[PDB]
């Protein structure tokens, strides 16, 4: 009974980082040595556990989180980072035990003209707690006046569209990310 990793990494559609997706992976024999030996992954960092020797461990629940962001931002997926992503979208805790996998996906999530389907939260009054998921779309009140659901001046929509274009630099290309949370 092998774990449904295929249903997460090889998924056809990934979610926007603001509404990141979580899959509960439990009751299955997982082989993590096939992942760390792929070369297709440009980012494979583990914290609290060693990359090698990952199979010699056992956990109560293993969560798989997925979303899309730019390359310039994959550095923010790690314990203790700051920036638009780790602040208002996806926050790892400081005592994080798991692995942060990510790979360039400019051939799937980019389109001629730009792919705006993917979104990220731009304004938020306070930072996220570790593993907080905020899908609220209320107008961000940046001024002294109420907004009452009307955009305008000092009344902005709190989500921004990424707009990945194939002709961009590598730092602003779409990247698919998977985060493994291990509960010992």
């Amino acid at each position, epitope marked *: 009974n092998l774990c449904p990793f295929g249903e997460v990494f090889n998924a056809t559609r990934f979610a926007s980082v603001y509404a990141w997706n979580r899959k509960r992976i439990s009751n299955c024999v997982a082989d993590y040595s096939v992942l760390y030996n792929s070369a297709s992954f440009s980012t494979f960092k583990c914290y609290g556990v060693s990359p090698t020797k990952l199979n010699d461990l056992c956990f109560t629940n293993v969560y798989a989180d997925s979303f899309v962001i730019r390359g310039d931002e994959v550095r923010q997926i790690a314990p203790g980072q700051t920036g638009k992503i780790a*602040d208002y979208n996806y926050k790892l805790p400081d005592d994080f035990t798991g692995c942060v996998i990510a790979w360039n996906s400019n051939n799937l999530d980019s389109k001629v003209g730009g792919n705006y389907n993917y979104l990220y939260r731009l304004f938020r*009054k306070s930072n996220l707690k570790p593993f907080e998921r905020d899908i609220s779309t209320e107008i961000y*009140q*940046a001024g*002294s006046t109420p907004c009452n659901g009307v955009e305008g001046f000092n009344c902005y929509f709190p989500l*921004q569209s990424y707009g990945f274009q194939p002709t*961009n630099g590598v730092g*602003y290309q779409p990247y698919r990310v998977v985060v493994l949370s291990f509960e010992l």
Partner: antibody
Amino acid sequence: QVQLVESGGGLIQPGGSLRLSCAASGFIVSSNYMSWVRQAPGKGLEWVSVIYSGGSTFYADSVKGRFTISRDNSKNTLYLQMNSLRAEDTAVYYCARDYGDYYFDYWGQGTLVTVSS
Amino acid sequence: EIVLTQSPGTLSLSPGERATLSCRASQSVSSSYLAWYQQKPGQAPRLLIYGASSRATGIPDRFSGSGSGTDFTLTISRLEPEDFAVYYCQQYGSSPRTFGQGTKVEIKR
């Protein structure tokens, strides 16, 4: 309605400290990104610091470890504590609200800071 | 580390002429993440264009920018006696954000 008024500028000895203020009207500094932008005499613009609405802060490399940007929610004022100033720090310091770490869409009036012995 | 080189350095033109300012970057500026600012003499910069095309609020229609990748351009269709200032382009497609050195729009005589 919406205004940005700087203060705290003046002549200061090299190596000394100075705190700039940015009284805001119509804005809520605790709800916007707030950046400091300095312009040396005759030269162009230069980004200094920024403080995200959530609290995170970032600094240019030429002022890293010497400047500290903060805010007082109670007085709706933006601060910029400068330490170990030097002559290359002399410039007009603007405080501006920027649209999310992107562009600065509303600027203040500017306050001159002169560092000279 | 993205460096913006505006050109020319000064631009001599008379009221009513078309003004075109260049802004070339060393590396690709992803997504057309480029702004344009105007600084009249003795005043705080003002925002003109955000996004290399999207016009700021209240800015007159004669301002209009274009460009993509490594070459941008702020154009002034019919210049006015109050558009003789320095214009800064600014990139935010990578950190840290950097400015240009400026283009001065003179008065041709």
